[PDB]
Amino acid sequence: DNYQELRVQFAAQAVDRNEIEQWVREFAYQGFDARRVIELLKQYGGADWEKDAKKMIVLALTRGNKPRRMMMKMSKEGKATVEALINKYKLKEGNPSRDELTLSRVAAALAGWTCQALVVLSEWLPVTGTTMDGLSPAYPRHMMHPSFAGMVDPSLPGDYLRAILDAHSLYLLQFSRVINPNLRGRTKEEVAATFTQPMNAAVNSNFISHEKRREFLKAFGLVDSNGKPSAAVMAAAQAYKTAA
Amino acid sequence: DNYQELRVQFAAQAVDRNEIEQWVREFAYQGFDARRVIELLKQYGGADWEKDAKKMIVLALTRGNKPRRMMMKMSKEGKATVEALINKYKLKEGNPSRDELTLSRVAAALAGWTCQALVVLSEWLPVTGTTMDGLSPAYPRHMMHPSFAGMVDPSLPGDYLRAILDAHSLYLLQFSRVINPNLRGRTKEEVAATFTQPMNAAVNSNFISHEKRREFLKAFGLVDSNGKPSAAVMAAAQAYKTAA
Amino acid sequence: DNYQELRVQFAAQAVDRNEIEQWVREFAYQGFDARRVIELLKQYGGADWEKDAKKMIVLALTRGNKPRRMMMKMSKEGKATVEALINKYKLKEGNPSRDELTLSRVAAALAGWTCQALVVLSEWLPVTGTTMDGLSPAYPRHMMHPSFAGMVDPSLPGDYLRAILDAHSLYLLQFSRVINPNLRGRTKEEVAATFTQPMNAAVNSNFISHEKRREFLKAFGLVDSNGKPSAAVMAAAQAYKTAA
Amino acid sequence: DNYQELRVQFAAQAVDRNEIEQWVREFAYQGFDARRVIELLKQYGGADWEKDAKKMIVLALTRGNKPRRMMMKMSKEGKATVEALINKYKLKEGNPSRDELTLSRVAAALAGWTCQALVVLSEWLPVTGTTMDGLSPAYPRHMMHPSFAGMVDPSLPGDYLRAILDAHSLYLLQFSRVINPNLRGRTKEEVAATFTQPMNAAVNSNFISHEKRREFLKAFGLVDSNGKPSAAVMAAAQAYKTAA
Amino acid sequence: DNYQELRVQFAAQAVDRNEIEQWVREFAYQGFDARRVIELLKQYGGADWEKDAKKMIVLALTRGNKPRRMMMKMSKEGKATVEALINKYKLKEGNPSRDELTLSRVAAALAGWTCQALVVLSEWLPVTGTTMDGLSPAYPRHMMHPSFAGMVDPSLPGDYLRAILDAHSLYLLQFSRVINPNLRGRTKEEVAATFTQPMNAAVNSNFISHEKRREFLKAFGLVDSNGKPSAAVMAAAQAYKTAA
Amino acid sequence: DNYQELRVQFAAQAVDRNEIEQWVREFAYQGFDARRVIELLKQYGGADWEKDAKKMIVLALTRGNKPRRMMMKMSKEGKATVEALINKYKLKEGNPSRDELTLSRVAAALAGWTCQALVVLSEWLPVTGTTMDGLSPAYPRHMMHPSFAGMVDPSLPGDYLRAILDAHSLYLLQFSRVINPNLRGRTKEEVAATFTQPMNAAVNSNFISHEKRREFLKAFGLVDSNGKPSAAVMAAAQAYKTAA
Numbered sequence A, B, C, D, E, F: 001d002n003y004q005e006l007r008v009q010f011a012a013q014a015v016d017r018n019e020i021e022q023w024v025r026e027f028a029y030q031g032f033d034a035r036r037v038i039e040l041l042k043q044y045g046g047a048d049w050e051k052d053a054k055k056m057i058v059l060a061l062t063r064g065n066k067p068r069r070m071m072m073k074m075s076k077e078g079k080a081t082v083e084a085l086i087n088k089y090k091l092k093e094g095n096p097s098r099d100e101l102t103l104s105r106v107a108a109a110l111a112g113w114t115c116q117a118l119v120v121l122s123e124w125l126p127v128t129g130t131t132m133d134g135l136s137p138a139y140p141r142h143m144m145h146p147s148f149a150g151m152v153d154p155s156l157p158g159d160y161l162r163a164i165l166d167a168h169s170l171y172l173l174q175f176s177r178v179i180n181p182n183l184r185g186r187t188k189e190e191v192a193a194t195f196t197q198p199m200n201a202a203v204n205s206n207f208i209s210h211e212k213r214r215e216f217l218k219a220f221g222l223v224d225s226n227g228k229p230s231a232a233v234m235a236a237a238q239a240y241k242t243a244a
């Protein structure tokens, strides 16, 4: 019938904030699917899934996300362990489908442990805690993996949240440059453009509730009882502002 | 068979301004066919077309115009929703025939609702309202999509019309550079050349009467009862004049 | 027999100015073949050829030389008209053979009318008359298409002819930049190099006699009874000298 | 089988300057075989070869050395003429075998006429006489083709010869850059390296005796009765010295 | 099937420093498998393996790691020798499996001899001893191959160890740029990132005991009886600090 | 058995200077094989080999190393001579196998004569002796071919040897630029990098003994009875230092 009238009638319909925001979340960029990662770990791993996941996290943090490549530069024993992990958990490189595991995904799905492991693994990461201390004193080790974004409570007060993300970004700037010998022709802003979408996706995901995320941030020593960031976090956020 | 004479006699024929301008309008650039878009929505969607159209507008404004691509990085629920929408509405990408739907066409055909939805969607757009506010105070959220051009009454007094279009162009300028990173190095003038044709086409189209367009402008708070643009529009029109 | 003597005997033959110059003309660069264009229009079009040619000229001036592309961004009605024109006149894009019509060729073959149409179509061209007025006051609208080169009488006095071509070139510089987002790394001289060969070919063609061409230039208000260019032409030629 | 001894005895053998220089002349660069070119013209052309050769020289000087390419942008009459010439003379492009004709070879073999034709063809060459006049007053029109090198008497006194060749090189320098746009950024010295071999080859070739070459130079007004270069040559030789 | 809870319980599990560091060592980068290399040499070579290994080390240090490529530019005798070595030892290029020999692996596995051979091979290396002497006086010849890292005792006092490794890195810095010309434009820090992993891997490997490594350092004159680095090492460690 | 002990036992083996240096020589870069060149010349040429080799040397020096290409720009007679040489000696371009002749290889294998021929061929080389005199007075003609490196006695005193190679390098810098219109974006050091490996290979080859090489250098007037370079050589070496 009358198309102009239909458009006009359509414009007169409610602009429902609760409804729209639900769709935004449902349709938002998702870098990885944590619930599917953990389901697949439990599926492939049975009783061994927890111990194997810790190994895989150590592999992700100290060797990276390419299982077949790291095998080419590894001890005979280590290589056999990794081959057995690839075979058991059907591990892939890069960004495969939802139904496929990667080392990075295991690390991100279980970031509550990953971030703690970083306290131990500091001197073996692509960028060491020693280096980070040179940019910002007592740089929080818990922030030293892309996984950490899954620990950030997005409901923190505007300035606290910003401090946390800025402080984390200081690491992300260094890390991205080290793992990519191509971001040489890249400013701070240009490097950020490649890391903030996966960062923000994890910050805003529905995996681990806001309260549980903040509890982790508190237990890690990154915020106090009110969500105010620690001295170290404040220092690292300040360093990000003046970093290039 | 005297061709020079034929060329000459052809030159002696009336240059009828009325007849030629009618041909200009017939042949003019058209970005989309709003009437056909509504018809196709009504056709494919039946009783669900209205709710589906809103979802499709939210997708268009927050994720873009490529339904297959966005699905690769999305929650399981959202991926299922978009898949079904693709199958139900035979969604395509880019600029197919008038007999085919895209996400951008849905938002353009139903601009009256799209522009109200921008108020809610502000923080989630490729260029946020907060970013717009740094260029021009309280930038009108209703102007923050190419769709807005379909709400502009071309019968507005010259200076009021130009103010509306200049204010809108301030957004178009930022948005075009974000969506097409290869326009970052181009001048305002050059970027304008890439958005001006679809803008003017929607401004001057026969879809939705001038009187209804103006009443949307009045309802949105963009003009007053006497056709005069608000302070926010004037501010934004001035920012566009001195923008780079 | 003796090759050296044959070359020497050959060198002793007349260097016939009338004969050589005839060969130059016969062998010169020809961008399009106006007589073949008009023959094909009359062939394909019958009684409708004159009206259709005017439509095609309007299409060429306001949409360009790509019939299948412009159809993708056009009203349903306009698109059906163009499809019928393509089918009837076997229209092609770019530079096909002598035996093939294009919109550009129709415009150039009938430049006596095309140049007059420009007075009407000014504000709808890729570069508007408004813009040209910003570079040179009262810029002659008749000069605002590559077609105009077919109107230039090459027997005009050296300085008058130069003024006409310089004034036209001011437009050609702007036009070439607008239709080619590649001549960004191009100086005035570099842009000229791409437009002067088609310009000069048409200036020197044997289609429309020198006297008839000058009559057009006079009727257009571009020269007086002695071939002296108008004030507007003189201004535009001066602007070309200092343009970059 | 003592190879060092064989190498040694080989070194002890005469270095005969007369014998070696004879080998230099046998093996020297030859740009074209003038005798064969005339023979082929006479063969393919019969009674029409002289008139056809002149047309071919006009083509070579005003359109270039690619008969198939030039045909694509030419009048109907001219296209038919070139087609027939291609078929009658089996014209080729570039540098085929000595048993094949090109347009450039015809002009080179018949340089005595080619160079006189330059007087008439001046405004229509890739570098015009008027352009040459801006570099050196009254630049000799007879020097404005690579063909001219075949008219140079190498037995001229050193300083006269060098003046003729320097004056000619002024043209070669401009012409090489026009014909090969990728030489615009190169130094005079570098451009010289690209034209000097065919130049010297024609200067020193056995086609047309030194005495007849000199009498052409005298007839052309390039040298006087005592072998001395004209003012125009001297001027042009000096302009080449200080050219970039 | 509560995945958040599973993630949470996983986070509550011990972060056992001893257990995690054991996993780091298992999974650590390994450049080559020295034990397997010797086994393969002994296997393929029988009674000739020792003499063949020395030839292979000389090839590695003076020609590189690509046996097929070097053969193309070599004396007849040498080409025959390398061909036979390739056939006898099944030599490969690059980084194949642990069950395959390369020239570089032979030199690395047998580093104690390789490093002594550098004294003799000095003038014939890609970076000569004389060049090293210009950067740091009497640069230790024993350090002038990546192999040297396998002679470094990691149990040396921190400052002595670092001095040995810094002195060695001065060579690694020059050598990496010569071998990979695309590293000439990179910073010291960037070049270091390309040599540090295989360096540290050999430093910390379980092949050859710390005590035997140190006694090689003492025998080579690189440290004294009290573990202290020689003047030459200290000089070279200082040159690395201020190197670009 | 015990791999660590085997490596340690291997390190305890002699580092035999005489033995190692023999392997270096056997394994060194070889650009061409002079003994194989001369054997092939004698094989293919029989009684005509010596005269044909002189022709081939003249061809190499005045036309280059591409027999099929030079034929395309040559007299009928010269071309037939070269075709007969290609057929008889199975000549190739570039760097084919040991068992294949090239013009360059004939020139280098017989450099004792080649270098003498250069005194005659000076003004016909790609870079003339006249040009070289402009860079360094009385530049030694004998040095004006890559072949000359086969004449250099590497046992000359350090400073004399360096003078000889520097003086020769002055030519090599000019020559490499002239035969390669790509080394335009190349410094002196960058050009040297392309010519020193073939230079040094020939300087250090075992073809023609040190004493015989020095005898040639003496007979050429390039060194005196003690091996001290002439004035001309000293001048040319000095010019190389300050050349760019």
Ligand SMILES: O=N[O-]
Residues within 6 Å of the ligand: A029, A030, A031, A032, A033, A198, A201, A202, A203, A205
């Ligand atoms: O990318 N979703 O954490």
Ligand SMILES: O=N[O-]
Residues within 6 Å of the ligand: B029, B030, B031, B032, B033, B034, B201, B202, B203, B205, B207
């Ligand atoms: O082309 N916009 O209706």
Ligand SMILES: O=N[O-]
Residues within 6 Å of the ligand: C029, C030, C031, C032, C033, C198, C201, C202, C203, C205
């Ligand atoms: O290009 N001939 O008008």
Ligand SMILES: O=N[O-]
Residues within 6 Å of the ligand: D029, D030, D031, D032, D033, D034, D201, D202, D203, D205, D207
């Ligand atoms: O090679 N010119 O006769």
Ligand SMILES: O=N[O-]
Residues within 6 Å of the ligand: E029, E030, E031, E032, E033, E034, E201, E202, E203, E205, E207
């Ligand atoms: O990985 N070096 O033993």
Ligand SMILES: O=N[O-]
Residues within 6 Å of the ligand: F029, F030, F031, F032, F033, F198, F201, F202, F203, F205
């Ligand atoms: O490259 N051996 O002379």
